[PDB]
């Protein structure tokens, strides 16, 4: 809301010491132009499988009882 480069999500990892510490904006900024992710088809799968890996890592960060989505009705006749 101030206009500076301090977001609460896209700027995690920025400290006062060793100001070369990378943030998520810099990582996504240097990966959007790597001469192999320059066409449309190669960027789509990159974002898809990166999001899939982050979801798989976020899933098992709970402690309560976890319900499954849909496990019943596999009728194969």
């Amino acid at each position: 809301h101030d206009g500076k480069d301090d977001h609460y999500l896209w700027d995690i990892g920025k400290k006062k010491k060793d100001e070369n510490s990378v943030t998520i904006r810099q990582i996504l900024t240097t990966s959007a132009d790597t001469k192999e992710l320059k066409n449309a088809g190669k960027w789509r799968e990159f974002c898809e499988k990166l999001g899939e890996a982050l979801y798989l890592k976020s899933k098992d960060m709970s402690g309560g009882l976890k319900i499954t989505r849909r496990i019943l009705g596999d009728a194969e006749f």
Binding site: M61, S62, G63, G64
Partner: protein, 228 residues
């Protein structure tokens, strides 16, 4: 040593509040039993039952109030023949309130006082002319104050409040809180400590809901609810 949350009685702290004790709650973060260490062991106060909270929807809805007459500004604008824009007025410094003047000491004797209600007076006749309220000197255009456009006294707005599943005494107290007595007045807006902002609210018709068909204007039950 203690935070400001432990400087008042434990019954006046907000229910569904925060963690002020010494241990860190972030350890019980991935478990559902964490939320029970942040609520009061008795329930919800009378104001977190009409107005909502987190994990409970409130049952009173306000609305946008609209003007009905012509504006009638405070300072006439620079473009004549245009009765839809006012003139500017420069305010004073208006900076942050210190809470180390109501709690002066540091040990245990100094608790937290009440709720800081501003008083009604007439000190805008000195701002409108360009002077300071304390000293009589002029106001400079420093890069720390504001230049606003303000309405004058004598306007009339109109709004509407919807409510559901209220008791009788809750409606009586809400009407007592909307319309005050004959000599009193509310306060809203900016720069409340300089006289600016003094409204008075009157209550027009009240319509109830009997069934899904009829609605039964209930104006004849107000002197009951109030007393109740």
């Amino acid at each position: 040593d203690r935070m400001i949350g432990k400087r008042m009685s434990a019954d006046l702290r907000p229910c569904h509040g925060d963690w002020v004790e010494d241990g860190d709650l972030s350890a019980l973060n991935a478990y559902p039993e964490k939320r029970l260490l942040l609520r009061h062991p008795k329930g919800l106060c009378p104001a977190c039952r009409l107005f909502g909270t987190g994990s409970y929807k409130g049952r009173v809805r306000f609305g946008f109030a609209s003007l009905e007459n012509d504006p009638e500004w405070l300072i006439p604008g620079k473009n004549p023949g245009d009765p839809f824009h006012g003139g500017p007025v420069m305010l004073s410094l208006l900076e942050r309130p210190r809470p180390t003047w109501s709690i002066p000491g540091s040990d245990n004797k100094f608790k937290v006082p009440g709720r800081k209600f501003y008083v009604h007076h007439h000190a805008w006749k000195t701002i409108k002319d360009g002077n300071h309220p304390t000293t009589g000197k002029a106001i400079e255009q420093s890069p720390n104050n504001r230049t606003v456009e303000a309405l004058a006294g004598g306007n009339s707005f109109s709004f509407e409040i919807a409510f559901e599943n209220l008791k009788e005494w809750e409606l009586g107290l809400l009407i007592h809180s909307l319309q005050l007595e004959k000599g009193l007045a509310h306060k809203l807006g900016m720069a409340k400590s300089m006289g600016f902002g003094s409204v008075e609210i009157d209550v027009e018709s009240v319509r109830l809901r009997k069934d899904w068909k009829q609605w039964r204007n209930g104006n004849s039950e107000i002197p009951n609810w109030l007393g109740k």
